[PDB]
Design a protein around this nucleic acid. Structure first.
Lengths: 218, 150, 51
RNA sequence: ACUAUGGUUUUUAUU
RNA sequence: CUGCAUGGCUGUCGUCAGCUCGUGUUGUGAAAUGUUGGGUUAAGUCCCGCAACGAGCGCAACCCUUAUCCUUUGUUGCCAG
RNA sequence: AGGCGGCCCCCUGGACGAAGACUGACGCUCAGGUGCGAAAGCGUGGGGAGCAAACAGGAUUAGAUACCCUGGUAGUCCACGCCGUAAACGAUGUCGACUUGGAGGUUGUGCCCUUGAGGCGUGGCUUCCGGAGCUAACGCGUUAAGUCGACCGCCUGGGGA
């Protein structure tokens, strides 16, 4: 993605003792990942993501980590995909049989504003009716049309998004994650070297992942 | 790809005031008949719903194991918490045989002949789990992919 | 006597910080950030130790 | 806490 | 004769605000959860918020009534013009 | 190990650390056997401030053979022995070894003149969480209840016991 199978390194202090098989030392004071694994680790992930998207396999992008909460759509609409950035309330993919009703509660909360008094008055119920309506309308706006389950999950941070990676491991769904020397590679099926804090990283790095799904849609 | 079997529905013995509480509990097993199986328990105020809940608890709890065309590949041992099992393949004119959890969990694993006994703890939600270890201990004939080829 | 302040008093009333008006018990729950207090009032400290 | 201080009510058809 | 057989009738804590269910999570399991937390009220009353999310019953609201107004009628009453 | 701190001097078995050598399987564990008492108990004296089974009474109470108080023998102390037992506890048999981290106590040791108002490495022992792993649960986890190899002892229902 974006700059090919090359390494640069990130951060000068505190890294995860589980990353010993992937760390190569320090270069320009930052810790760096082994080039000899960087090259294939990118390639096997983009080559499978191309194939999943070629089966029309639905890709779900997660942006519950603040830096990606807008890029999860504004940098990802470049392909056919779905997106979430709010908290999941538990079971958002593992409890679909009961969670599918949230889209019908979003339908019913709009019907509660069909009263003839709601048009003519200015503040009485105008804010009372919006406490859940305008939060469900926001949190579901990138997934409500899907009507089912995704076939792959993409995360910017495997420690922040872990409460959703748990549901992917309950459905046997492959999770694709960005990793650094302070990340942990467990519970995720594909891992690629990167960060979310230089600076302004995901603003183009996530666009280079949406570019893989765009090639899956030819 | 989805094969389901019931072991027992029973009435719970828990007393509440004037009698034993009106609920039913079901124990079930679910698998694919060729390499996956799991166990589930469920409770309801009617028999069909206890099964409906247990069968889903089994379908959400499946484990990956190896078979040889509904036959045992070798004599195999299984262990769980305070319990043990032993299972071996049969010869012609015999094969059924067995009761309780073993008559259920092996039929959703695709098994059509066995000789088996369970030891130690008698609770079927423990016996079924020593039987699952007693399948996960069995060696695969599958050609996956270099070690034994091919 | 193991006293905090003594000798020139002789007082009709005794008071000393962080030993009266109860200030608890078990107040630092779900979550009681106290806006800024733990940032200074728990630096030293270090007598719990730890364990 | 300076309230110095303390015992019973049948086993047996029932909640 | 029998409310330790059953439908109906009916008492009180108390007119107290509380009691629970479907599905997910946890635990081997009886169960735990949500109903707990944080503001606020007479009130699980009204809001905020979490591995919980949604929901019924009761609470509060109708109606009876009091301080006024709109309106119509008048002896056996009241009795000024 | 049980345990061992008021202090000073004399005697004395080992402990931990930094770095090497020469010897050359001499090892590790153990039925019986050998050596070591916490407190109480005994024999023979000394010592006797208090404390103190039991004792004689107060007071409380329905009772007081408990608590509180007044008095108190054996014992506690010293010397030499007998007694040999305990929740003798990390309830983890004795030995060899592997395998992530984090907030602490105590104590050797390598190097830098500490840039300066410092520390970073590296052995031993201990405290509380805790990973891989385990257990019924609670716990353990480099001081393992985990995984491995060696040796010796014990247990097979409760009430009687």
């Amino acid at each position: 993605m974006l700059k090919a199978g090359v390494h640069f390194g990130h951060q000068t202090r505190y890294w995860n003792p589980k990353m010993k098989p992937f760390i190569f030392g320090a270069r320009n004071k930052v810790h760096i990942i082994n080039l000899e694994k960087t090259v294939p680790m990118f390639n096997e992930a983009l080559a499978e993501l191309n194939k999943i998207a070629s089966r029309k396999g639905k890709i779900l992008f997660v942006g519950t980590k603040r830096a990606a909460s807008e890029a999860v759509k504004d940098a990802a609409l470049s392909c056919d995909q779905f997106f979430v950035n709010h908290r999941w309330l538990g079971g958002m993919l593992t409890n679909w049989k009961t969670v599918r009703q949230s889209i019908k509660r979003l339908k019913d909360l709009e019907t509660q504003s069909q009263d003839g008094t709601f048009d003519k008055l200015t503040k009485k119920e105008a804010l009372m009716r919006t406490r859940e309506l305008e939060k469900l309308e926001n949190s579901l706006g990138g997934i409500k049309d899907m009507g089912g389950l995704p076939d792959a999950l993409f995360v910017i941070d495997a420690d922040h998004e872990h409460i959703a990676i748990k549901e992917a491991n309950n459905l046997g769904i492959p999770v694709f994650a960005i990793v650094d020397t302070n990340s942990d590679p467990d519970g995720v099926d594909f891992v690629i070297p990167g960060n979310d804090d230089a600076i302004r990283a995901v603003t183009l790095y996530l666009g280079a992942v949406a570019a893989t799904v765009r090639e899956g849609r030819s | 790809e989805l094969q389901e079997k019931l072991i027992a529905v029973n009435r719970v013995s828990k007393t509440v005031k004037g009698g034993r509480i009106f609920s039913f509990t079901a124990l079930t097993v679910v698998g694919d008949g060729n390499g996956r199986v799991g166990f589930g328990y469920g409770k309801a105020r009617e028999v069909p719903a206890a099964i409906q809940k247990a069968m889903e608890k089994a379908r959400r709890n499946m484990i990956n194991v190896a078979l040889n065309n509904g036959t045992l590949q070798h004599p195999v041992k299984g262990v769980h918490t305070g319990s043990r099992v032993f299972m071996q393949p049969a010869s012609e004119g015999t094969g059924i045989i067995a009761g309780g959890a073993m008559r259920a969990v092996l039929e959703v694993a695709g098994v059509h002949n066995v000789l088996a006994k369970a030891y130690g703890s008698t609770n079927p939600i423990n016996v079924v789990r020593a039987t699952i270890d007693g399948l996960e201990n069995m060696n695969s004939p599958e050609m996956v992919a270099a070690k034994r080829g091919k | 006597i193991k006293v905090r302040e003594n000798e020139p008093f002789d007082v009709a009333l005794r008071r000393f910080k962080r030993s009266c008006e109860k200030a608890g018990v078990l107040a630092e729950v779900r979550r009681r950030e106290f806006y800024e207090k733990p940032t200074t009032e728990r630096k030293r400290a270090k007598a719990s130790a730890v364990k």
